[PDB]
C-alpha cells in the first residue's frame, strides 16, 4: 500500500492505495464508488460526477514512481484549495487535501506511505 486516503466526512470510506490506479465517482465502474446510502441524501452528492477524479502512481521520467491526481468532474476537483481543472492532471504530495465541487469542501487527505 503506497498511499492511503483519509475520509474527512461521513458518507465516505477510507482507502488504502494498493493498485496503481483508482477511479472515484458515482458510476459503478469506479474502484472507489460514492455510494454509501447516508451520502446519497446530502445534496452535495448531487454535485459529484459519475467519474469525478482518479489517483494513480506511475514510473516518471527519472525512473521513479510518482503519484498523480487527474480531474474529470464537472464541478471540480481541488488540491489544497487549488482547482485541478477538467481533463488536467497534477502530482499529488503527502498531506494533500482533496475537495470536491467547492474548493473548501474537503473530503480526503492523501498520505504518501513512501517515506514512512
Amino acid at each position: 500500500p503506497w498511499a492511503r486516503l483519509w475520509a474527512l466526512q461521513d458518507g465516505f470510506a477510507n482507502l488504502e492505495c494498493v493498485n496503481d490506479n483508482y477511479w472515484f465517482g458515482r458510476d459503478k465502474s469506479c474502484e472507489y464508488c460514492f455510494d454509501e446510502p447516508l451520502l446519497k441524501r446530502t445534496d452535495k452528492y448531487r454535485t459529484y460526477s459519475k467519474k469525478h477524479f482518479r489517483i494513480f502512481r506511475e514510473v516518471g521520467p527519472k525512473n521513479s514512481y510518482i503519484a498523480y491526481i487527474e480531474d474529470h468532474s464537472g464541478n471540480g476537483t481541488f488540491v489544497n484549495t487549488e482547482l485541478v481543472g477538467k481533463g488536467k492532471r497534477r502530482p499529488l504530495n503527502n498531506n494533500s487535501e482533496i475537495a470536491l465541487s467547492l474548493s473548501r469542501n474537503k473530503v480526503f487527505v492523501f498520505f504518501d506511505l513512501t517515506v514512512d
Binding site: D27, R46, T47, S49, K50, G74, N75, L102
Partner: peptide, 8 residues
C-alpha cells in the same frame, strides 16, 4: 446515473 447538478 443521474446527470450532475452543475453549481455554476
Amino acid at each position: 446515473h443521474f446527470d450532475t447538478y452543475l453549481i455554476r
